[PDB]
Amino acid sequence: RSYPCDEKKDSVIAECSNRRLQEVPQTVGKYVTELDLSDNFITHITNESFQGLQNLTKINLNHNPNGLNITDGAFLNLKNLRELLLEDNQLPQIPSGLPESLTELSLIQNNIYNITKEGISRLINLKNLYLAWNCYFNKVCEKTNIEDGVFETLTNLELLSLSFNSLSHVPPKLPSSLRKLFLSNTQIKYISEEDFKGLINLTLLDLSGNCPRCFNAPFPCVPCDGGASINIDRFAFQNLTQLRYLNLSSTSLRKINAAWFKNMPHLKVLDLEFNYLVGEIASGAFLTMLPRLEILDLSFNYIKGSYPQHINISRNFSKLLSLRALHLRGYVFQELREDDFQPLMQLPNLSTINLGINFIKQIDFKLFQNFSNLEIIYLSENRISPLFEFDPHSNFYHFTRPLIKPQCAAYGKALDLSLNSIFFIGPNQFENLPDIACLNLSANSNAQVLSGTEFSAIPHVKYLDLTNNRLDFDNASALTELSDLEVLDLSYNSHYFRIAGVTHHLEFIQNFTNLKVLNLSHNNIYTLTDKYNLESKSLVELVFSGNRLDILWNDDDNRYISIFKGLKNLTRLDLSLNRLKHIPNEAFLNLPASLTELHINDNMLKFFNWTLLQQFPRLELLDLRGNKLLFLTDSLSDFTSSLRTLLLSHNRISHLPSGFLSEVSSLKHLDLSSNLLKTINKSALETKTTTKLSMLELHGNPFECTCDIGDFRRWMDEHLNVKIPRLVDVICASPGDQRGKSIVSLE
Template sequence: MISSSHRFPLSPAFQRLLFILVLLCLSLSCSGRTWAQRKLPCDVISLNQSESFDCSDRKLLQVPQDISRNATWLDLSSNQIKKLSGTSFRNLRNLTRLDLSNNFNPQKHPLIIENQTFSMLDQLKELLLDGNGLSAVSSALPSRLRFLSLKFNRIKTIRPNDFMHVRLLETIHLTGNCDYGSVCNGPLVIENRTFSHLTYLASLSLSNNRLIGVPQFLPPSLQQLKLKQNTITHIHQHDLSGLTRLRLLGLSGNCPVCSNTPISCSPCNTSNGALQIHPYAFRKLSKLQELRLSGNSLDHLQSSWFENLTNLRYLYLSFNRLVGEIANGDFLSVLPGVEVMDLSYNHPGQSSYSHNLKLSMNFSNLTSLKTLHLENYVFSTLHKNDLNPLYNLSHLSVLNLGTNFIYQTNLSLFGMFHNLSSVGLSENKFSFLSKREDVLSICGCSCGYELNRDRFGPYVHKDRLYRRHLPNIKPKCIAYGPVLDLSRNNIFHINPDMLQGLDNTACLNLSSNSIGDMFNGSEFVHFPKLKYLDLSQNKIYLRYEHAFSELTELEVLDLSHNNHYFVVAGLNHSLAFMENLGSLKVLNLSWNEISTLTHNNISSSSLQELNFQGNCLDIMWKICQNYELFRALQNLTSLDLSYNKLHRVPPEVYKHFPKTLRRLSLSKNRLKVFGWETLTQLPHLEELDLSKNKLEQVACALTSSIKFLDLSQNRISQLAPGFLGGARSLYVLDLSFNLLELINQTTFETGAENHLQQLSLQGNPLHCTCDLLDFHLWMRRNEVELPLLATEVTCDMPVERRGKSVLSYDIEECVNDENAMAFCIITSFLIILILLVSLTAHLFYWDLSYILDYCGAKMKHRRRLVPTDFIYDAFVMYDTADPLASDWVLNHLRVELEERGEMARPLCLEERDWTLGMPVMDNLSNSVRQSRKTVFVLTDGFLLRGVVKMAALLVQQRLVEEGVDAMVLLLLQPQVLQRSRILHLRRRLCRRSVLEWPADASPAAQRWFWHHLKRTIRKDQTGTHTSLHSTYFTGR
């Protein structure tokens, strides 16, 4: 009888919650990371004093330099690193595991590893260099290395010196270096005694290297030797005799059956095209536990191979030609300890097949057998007597008879086993309509229709799929207990009479058939303990409310991909059957294109998870119906409504969602808006998935119960300030692949108000300007995990930073505390100073100017003036016809400037210094050119003389050519030019060049006047409009 052992699987809702808690724990374990660690393009996991860095698949061009010295594990696989040097790992002396796989770019060049690259890694024990295009084993490997993987490189030759300094190696992987299509012209060359000195070597993998024989002089310490898919044709007597500790030997695929091999294949050059194994080749392997001989075209198995294999537990013999051995083999009598045997795909390769399964009676000697795979034996009818050799195997729990094209059997025969818990009948031809005596002949199958049916996938089974369980069975199904797999058959009607004898079945898989029944509650009466029923990929018509009512213990029902009748117009569809399933917890109605239902709501008091994706809720809710569809699901905790083409969710729908909901998925729809305010009606909602929609805005506030919010792949361009204010429980927020350009400081909470543990922002077109400063500061102050922060959270603007990480943007460009404080102080001081000076100058201008000039005059130690090339200090122009003016110039001005003071100041006077007989213009021009300044003594009528105007023009010409203002105006009479605009303008521009003889004629005033005149004459005055005039007149 089938085992009635019962297992209690975890509910899906609880599994999701557990997953979230684990995720949060991982996030919390990283919360103590420093800002420098968070800037790394790696995921960091800290445990005690060690740290693991996962930097895989981050598009890195070199080894990150800021990895902690405490790092023990470092994964740099699947990057774009081109070269490794002696400085690449100089600070990582504590590394114990280093993964550098798949850094090879076939279009450019292989990974370059310099000699001293690993010289500093004294503690390194595991090194992975797979898929890097290496042409030789790296030299100077760390001496303490235990694990070395060099799979899928371009190594052509292996020499003893390659491993001379790594004598502690325990595992070496060299798979796929000289496979078909590689750069090797032949097999991988392994020189003699290459591995003989490795006395600790326990595992050696040399698969896919076109080896033509078993390598010689292998160390006796080997426990695993993998030689799969080479071109070995012979296993000689002494090839393996020295490997007495061997536990696993893989020889599969060396002489494949080329008629159904999906790779380049050529038959072995042996007498029968099969691998030739010496009768005593395995005699010394007494500790061998696993032997893989699949895909070797074997048609005979010698008992002597297995006589001494007393510890053998796993024997793989698929993809051979062993039909005769299965029927009459004596080798089965010497395998009492084998627990798993795979004899699949051993058809003889002829046009006709057997009507029955023929098993040798020696199968009864496999007293330890737990799992037997017999796929593709190819027979039409399975009778009770066909399995006689297996009935007494008390440990047999898994029997796989898939892909045999069986038309007829009585399932009750499987009830004769003692401990059978999984029966695999997938990929057969069962229809279960009626009993037939010779279905094969009726259907005319002798024509060989199934002969050319090739198996899609690897021609050698993956061991992990063919051990303790049936392949391709969902783990949740296996967890419930005994399994019956009838998937991928020709069943289009459930005949209860044909499904008898397996009362203890807990999981029934009927997926991928053509079942089109209208279930009425009588189809599964012979499965009273059924808990998991998979009817996906069929044509089921749901109409009657009593459907599945016989399954009182059913917990999981999968009705996905049954859209055949749901898309037919005019048919009635009902989900009322759910009300009668009192134990149902999970219902999958996905991908049925449901657009109409007879009842406006579905009812269940036990259902916890409903998958309703891939239907047509857009139609159901568009016509203002079915708003209350989910209202009566009293204990529903998880609801998946993705892929329903929804543009909006009517507000009335939110009101009728079950209050018990903890997870709601509306992802992969077309939502442009979402009723955030309606979340208050779901007080227990913890997970909300709105990814892959067209949302442009988010809520101003979230409910306090939300823990997980996925808003990825939408069109969100901005976040409302404080929109996480009420989300006190939100731990995970995904905003990746949106249109966010800026993130304000008020967007996320800080300090004690921040409960966020993980924030995803990759794929947003962020503007890396000073406007992003607030977000930078928020990241530094809050220990929130940002996945792929250093590699995928990149800038879009400005253009020069596009594609670079936001961390490459130095916020010091925007703010520096010390510099900012200094700048603030300086600018404040300058502003105050300017205000004070302006105010003081406005109120005390004349007083200050007097004080400054007076102090300057009283300075005892003045700097001596440097003599210049001028002949005269001043050329004095005055009215020679005016006796008063002439007297004042000759007797006062001349005397004061030429005869008094520390230095003589020669003057040029018209009456004294002009050359007689020379034209007036020449005298005038020479006087102006040879004098430092030209002093105009202004009296009434003086300006009317033409010579005065000419002198003024000559002085103005000096201003244009030399950039020096040489004009001094001396007003001898107060009333002169009182209304002259030119005089007023000059007083504004060149105040010191306009002097006035004091009217009171007091001695003090006269002394002050002479002081100013002397200073004005000696000091060069640069014109304020020199550049303008120069440009205008000269064109420069």
């Protein structure tokens, strides 16, 4: 059994991160090819640290300690080492004598202010070199000294990242093999004709944050003198014929020289966020030079103090023939009229329009159907009413997550109106809209009684998100006009459910023939009017977490005893966070017999009647984590033959009964972590048929490490197929001499 790392298997990885290791372990497997030692307390690396580990092709030593002192030539003997990650290590210099076999070296987030030939010129096989985030913002640091011609001999270098360093000028003598050059936030004020002359294979250039736009910056921002623009020579990109990505975000540009794109026939992504381009958006000659551009980001170009009535889009936007996505967040305007987006309406592949954060008060929604083929209409965070801190591996100027949840967008045309003020959906709200399949009305402070007519203009919505509103469910016909509804999210609409004296109606759930997923989470549901039961012939998943089944299933009330029984097709049920101390036997028996997955985690269960699992012949996963269960049944095989996963972590199990792990043949994963187990007896492990378990979790139990743990230690040796992860965390609580150590220590 591997210790202290966990080994996963054209390679074998030793997962050894975040285990409080004070030194590199001298017990790593001879066959290991990738060693992850990140987030440990290692303070020193010497030529003896990785001795006899010649198969290593990758080492990750990021975030060590919690600076790391690496001796000259510490990694020199590792002849197949290709990838070395040494991020966030407070390194004062590039380590000396690094192995010549390196193809990837990451030194992000260190204190390296000198890039010398001694450090990297001998690394002739380098393909990717990351030196970003060594001197930036108000960090006490020196200006970066790039030794003349340091990168020149790295003739296989394809990616060079020097962003978030004080460079002042583009380094001369860069190798012509470069494909991606990152120079964001480097204090480069001028780009000359010769700065990139030999870079004929360059596909990406990032010059963002040079002469930044600093008003309301969420980081320490130093603008160029007088808030001046970056000065790019007319011929600076004349030989960058292969450029596909260009990032000029936050370069304080007011004018874009169209000639910059004269010899960029393949430009695909142009990022111009955080500039002063309102004038250029209205009359952009550069827009005629970009017929293959697919993504154009012009977000946050607003004029401080100016809140115009309308957006002014140049007729030249009609020349962006290949445009697929247009981002115009933070332009800031009051109304979107149909005439305002006429230049975009004949672009055949424009599928995404992003107008988030524009303080838009009104939109003529009929304009969207006149676009060729919109698939994502993102209008989140507007004022529409009734009709280290930064991840160095992420985009600094915008979030990279999808605008709309992929599960919602997969259904078809999406309209996101979340975080607006549509407090009431009137009869004309969704008129003249395309066939919307995915609709998000989350966080619109909507307190209306939906009554079956509000969505009649878009009746083919398949995924509806109404979360975080104050909806008053007081009409049995609510949402029934949505005949094709498959996913309905009503999470966080507790406002009226929490008032006992008002009426509450959930009868509409029964009317849907295609409803698959329903989320009623965090609604504080504890009382219903007249109809106490949820019914659906189609529903497969119900999320009922954050409600009050402790009240609904109170021992003195029989009204909700069959609340979920009518969900005849249900396979997944989540009853977590319902303050349950016990479930009445009759209420558990009335859960749908079709269940395959049942979660009752994060309640306060003191008892669980295991005998009742007999009535659930399809139950594969039972999750009882985060409860107060004191014991386990000694005859689980008599009550279930389908259970494959049993999650019991964070409970108070102090003893396993005799014959527990052996008899349940279908059980593959048993999680007993964070319980109160002191020991595991020989009787508890084996009986007649050996264990069909493949994973047994035991970290966080207060084990007694005396000779009484010997039987379990021998069982672990005889059952190497049963994985017990994180042995470093399966720790001795007693006696004093063994406290803090893993149970696998002491013979």
